[PDB]
Amino acid sequence: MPLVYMNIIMAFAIALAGLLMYRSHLMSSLLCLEGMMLSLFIMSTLIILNTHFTLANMMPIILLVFAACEAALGLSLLVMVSNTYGTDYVQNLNLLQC
Amino acid sequence: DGPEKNYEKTMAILQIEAEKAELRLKELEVRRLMRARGDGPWYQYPTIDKALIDHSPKTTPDN
Amino acid sequence: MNPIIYTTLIMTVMSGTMLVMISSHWLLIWIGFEMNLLAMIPVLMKNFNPRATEAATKYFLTQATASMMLMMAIIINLLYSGQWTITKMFNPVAMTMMTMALAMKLGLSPFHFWVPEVTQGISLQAGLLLLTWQKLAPLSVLCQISQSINPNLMLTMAMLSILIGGWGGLNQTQLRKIMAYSSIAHMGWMTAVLPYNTTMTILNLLIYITMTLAMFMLLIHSSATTTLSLSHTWNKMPVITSLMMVTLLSMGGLPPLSGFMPKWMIIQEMTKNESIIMPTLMAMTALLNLYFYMRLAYSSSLTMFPSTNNMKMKWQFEHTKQMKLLPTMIVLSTLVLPMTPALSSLN
Amino acid sequence: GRIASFLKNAWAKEPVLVASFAIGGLAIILPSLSPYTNYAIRINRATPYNYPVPLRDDGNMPDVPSHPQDPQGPSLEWLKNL
Amino acid sequence: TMYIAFILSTIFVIGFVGFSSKPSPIYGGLGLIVSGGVGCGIVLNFGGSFLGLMVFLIYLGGMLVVFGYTTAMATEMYPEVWVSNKTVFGAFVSGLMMEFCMVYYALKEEEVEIIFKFNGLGDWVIYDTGDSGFFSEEAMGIAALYSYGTWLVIVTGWSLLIGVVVIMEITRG
Amino acid sequence: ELSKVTKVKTDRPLPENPYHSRARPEPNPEAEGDLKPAKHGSRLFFWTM
Structure with missing residues (x-):
């Protein structure tokens, strides 16, 4: 490669x-x-691009869309914490043990 | 009942159970061979369908 | 949460699982996983508590890491094969990464740590969905790629899952944590037979789903989350605790109850492939799960605990909420052993 | 009756949304109720992005135009007059 | 200039180390900014003008909202930089050393196998000699999303709407 | 008019194997006649039916 x-x-x-x-x-974890x-x-x-898979050129855009969806999920969870x-601080998430 | 009734019933039961045992061994061997070779109706893992291939004039002549 | 919004979120979780179980493209499987996570987080946080937020955050982090690893495996498989179809993966490194990701999604040990915490944090209603419906998609993906799965890694994960589930279940007094560790052990049991026969994995999944549905619905019908709180249920409703004892005995894998079916068939299939040490060890390690189930049965029905005076008022009122599927789930999880030859329909 | 009151109230309090829904509504309905959408499709098909690869003549292709510019074949005379 | 892509990829790894060592999220923001811009450069060099500009644009907008939060949630009285904590500096140095070691091993030793087999030749080799004609093949393939990928459009749109709903449900208390 | 697909009358033979493809592997044997019930039903341990 x-x-x-x-x-x-x-x-x-x-x-x-x-x-x-x-x-x-x-x-930083969300980063x-x-x-x-x-x-x-x-x-x-x-x-x-290298393999000229033309019809698959839309895959990275979908990946990016769901990426920023997960980012928004993370941001909302962050505000709630x-x-x-x-x-x-990640140490505050301590009530649930084992 | 007569002693022969149990005799014949036992013979029938033995025949059925022996056939079952032979069929079970046969099934185990058949399954092993089919999994090892993949030349039977079982363990036919799917492959790409060739109906998806586009047999039409492309842009570049070398296809 | 608005009931319409809750129904839309539940349907989105179900549609994500159906997308995973229906598509033939890896990108769409990953999309279904992403939709499942997106619609599962608010369902986890339907009742707003700091524990609920903590559970949602931990679940989101774990599932996000698993989805990233799965997409990396997909990308590597595409790089080394130029293929998106769900088939025999053509790269061992990609196969290993995908196996790790799917085990993390299922909660197979040593990726088991989040399950007891997320299960305890969320309510019983959300815990039922998490421990039953959220296992469908990764198991389906594993069943589709069972041919390319490295048997050693999957078997090690299954055995560790059973061991750790049993050990964790022994030190737990919270019912939700006990259920989570039992789920881990049963997931190990299911994934043990994946390289050998996937129909046995499907059978074990169905039996486990029925048993867990019955147990969680009984817990909801008793509104109990601890052993002490469940102990009081003998006074108000002895039928519920008796059925719970029967279902616990079934979960232990004791014949003639339905819980013997999956273990029996799994041992059969694993002995057909000349594996005799692994099924024996799994059967012996199931005794820890049987132990904590029996301890719960003692505290709940087999023995009677001290109640409180205020139960006298509760005696007068009858339950309003009615779960229509509970009797069927109890029956199917206890008295279906005479019906094993129905295994063929799953083929 | 109620519709007229609602629309008058809508354009008196929030005239911005009234225009947006009207413009958005037209963008969905008008294309179906148009005779030029088919022409738009035909123009896109007409444009020769890639080479028109010829086919071997077996002698039984009456309408296929074995020629530089003889009458057989598709015509763009409709586009010229558009 | 025959190894522009390799230099950009090294800067990509450098930025990933930079925001992976976990400095103050503000500084992680510019780390991700540099990584995204350099990745856009790589994709441009490989012919993906739209795709590279797309990652550049989206991450540029996304890291802005992260910065807004860094000043609202992850705001430490003394924000830490890569040379503020021995843990952060250690992670940064370890990442840089790992990258440099792998780069040196890949370059001086043509064929390198760490986990996959990497070839030390320039990335220009793998390029194709074909002609796309009057096309932007990446652009046409991407635009095929609305014609070929109707199912993808439906699922992505539904996921975005459900994402809005989920955000509102989560951030309601 | 320069974009229309035309017929070309040539004399060079049409290539038989332009891809230089190998011999396609023989397909698996295809099914059989009618179905009959299992010899003794499901032969699963003690189940007689």
């Missing part, structure tokens, strides 16, 4: 690792989610 594919896959891996490794804020979505968009777009706790 070309090195650009390697770089994009590595970017997706880094974003996934970042999302899996929270520090304090829930906003890592959006980064993974962007990396997947770039990967799919390069694949479709902040309203219920004052901060978006």
Whole structure:
């Protein structure tokens, strides 16, 4: 595979690792989610353009649409946590155990 | 009843059960062979339908 | 929440699952998963509580990670095959990533951690949907790609799921957490036979769905979320706790109850493929699930606990809400063992 | 009666929405009730984006135009007069 | 200039490391901005003008609403940068080192197999020699969404409407 | 008029295998005659029917 594919896959891996490794804020986790979505968009777009899969050129746009839908979901959950706790700190999500 | 009634019933039951056992072994072997080869009506995992291919003049001559 | 809006959200969850179970394109399967998550989050948060918000956030995070991994696997499979159809995946790395994503969606251990928390956070009405309907789409996807599934990874996940579900269920006094761990164990049981025979997975899924529907509807009919609160139900309504004991015995996998059907058929299919250690270990580990079910049966019906004085007023009133499917779900989950040869209809 | 009161009240309090629904409503109904939508379709088909690949002549194609500009074949004379 | 795409992809990875180390979300915002712009550049270089401009435009608008929230929810009295916490700086340095190591291994060693098999030649090689004619093939394929992809349009529209409904239901208390 | 599809009268033979395709694999055997009931019903353990 070309090195650009390697770089994009590595970017997706880094974003996934970042999302899996929270520090304090829930906003940064949503940032890592959006980064993974962007990396997947770039990967799919390069694949479709390279193979001239004309009818599949609409796939990245749909991916982007559902990506920002998930982003809006995350933002709404973020505001509710902040309203219920004052901060978006991931440590406040502690009532539910095990 | 007579002692022969149970005798004949036992013979019929033994015949049926032996046929069942032989059929079960046969079914196991048949299923194993069909899964290993995929040349029978079972384990026919689907493939791409060739009716989707567009056999029409494209843009580039080399298709 | 407006009832019209709630019905639209429920229909959107169902339409997402039907899109996953109906499409032939990977992009549409991922779209159905996304719609399921989008319409499931507010359904999780129908009753606004901080615990409900926490459950919704955790579920959203887990399902988002799983969907990202699934889409990455789809993209890699397209890259190495140029195919979008749901078929024999042509890349081992993509297959592994997709398996991890689908296990995370199902809650198979070690991706089990969110299930006890999200189940406890949400109400019984939402918990029933989460533990029954939300298992259809990933299981269907796994059944469609069972040929390409690496048997070792799936079997390890199934065995770990059973072990962890049993162990987690023993230390739980909250009914919802017990149900979540039992669900984890049963999901492990279902996914054990995926590489061998998917019709047994479908049978186990149907039996588990019936049993969990019966249990959750009985809990709703008793309005009980803890062992102590459920214990009082013997005084007001002994029929409910007796049926709950019967359903718990069925969930334990004790013959002649219906819960013996899936384990029996799974052991049969796994022994047909010369696997004798794994089904034996699974059967032995089911005893932990049977243990906590029996403990609940003691606290609920087999033994009577102290009630409170105020139950005298509750004795006079009769339940208004009527779940029409509860008797059928109880019967199908307890007395269907004489009907196993009906397995062929699932083929 | 009630419709006239509603429309007069609508255009007196929120005239912006009245225009938008009227304009939006026309954009859905008018295209169906038009004789030029078919012409719009024909124009798009008429435009030769890709090469018109010829077909082998077997001798039994009466209407297929084996020619530079002889009469057989489709004609764009309708578009010229449009 | 024969490796423009590779340079842009390296900057993509750099930005991903930048917002993956989790600085203040404000700084993660510009990290994602840089990553999106460079990805748009890559897609433009591969012929995806509309697609690259589309990711650029959408993420540019999306990160703005994130910035609005960073100042409303994730606002720390002392917002942290990549050189403010040893954890954040460690993550940033580790990501940069990983990227540099993999780039060096891929370049100096032509054939590299970390998980997949990557070839060290330039990305220009894989390009096709065909002629699209009077077409923007990406644009035509994308515009086929309204003619071929009616089902996709229906499902996406329904999902967006249900998304609006879900947002309103979630943010109501 | 320059965009119309025309007939070309050539003499070169029409290619028999333009794709240079291999021999298509033999299809699986296709079904059989009428159905009859299972020998002894469902042969599942102790079930006689």
